[PDB]
């Protein structure tokens, strides 16, 4: 019965070290997704704080320019 | 000089994928 | 003994098992929470690219036709 | 054309398997 | 080899114990990641729907009321 | 009512320590 329990026992290391790639090939890849993804919510959220300050200095500047026609 | 950027996961995400199949190759059968 | 030593290899193979499918559950929650993040960062970036497309247009269209007034 | 995101139903479901793996330690029974 | 079958043993469910921490900790910190893209996104689609809305309803005033002067 | 950024490094190293600790978990097998 040993040798049947040390085989049995090689057989589940083996699928266990498997596992084991699996999965960190699994979190590196999500990790590296969490990269993208802030990087992206960064970018656009940059681009439209750049969006809304033009409009609201541009908006506040017309005001002041058309106001002192009266 | 900034633009409006995108984002592409598919890569990661078949990536996913493989490693939910080479999580589903190391199930034991009793034996 | 020897038939302590197989139970507790059956135990082993046994809990193997169950986190192997934690496993495939957790990933697969990964992969479909990064398609909706990854969706709606796509939605809300082209809703931001039409909205600054619309001002654009618009306000260079009144530049010319005011412009054009003098 | 605006839209919202909304992970809750997935955040739930890691919390399952991460409670699923706290229920997979193996005692050592010896 | 008794001796060696359960030292073998007790080795396999030690490092099955250690990487089954490594990944609760994994999952865990991914769940938190979420949360946070979660509350970035929706928080940042906010204020883009802020900026149309107000955008929007005050040039269809100035329509109107601009419109009375005609 | 705010334009906010997103920060996940902290996450981020969490992780990568998470997926050393994965590798120093291998087997040998011996």
Do not use: C, P
Request: proline residues 0%; glycine residues 4%; without cysteine.
């Amino acid at each position: 019965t040993q040798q049947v329990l040390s085989e049995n026992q090689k057989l589940i290391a083996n699928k266990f070290n498997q596992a084991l790639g699996a999965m960190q090939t699994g979190f590196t890849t999500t990790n590296e997704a969490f990269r993208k993804v802030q990087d992206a919510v960064n970018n656009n959220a940059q681009a439209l704080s750049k969006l809304a300050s033009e409009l609201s200095n541009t908006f506040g500047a017309i005001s002041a320019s058309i106001g002192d026609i009266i | 000089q900034i633009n409006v950027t995108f984002l592409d996961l598919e890569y990661e995400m078949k990536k996913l994928e493989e490693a939910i199949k080479k999580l589903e190759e190391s199930y034991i059968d009793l034996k």
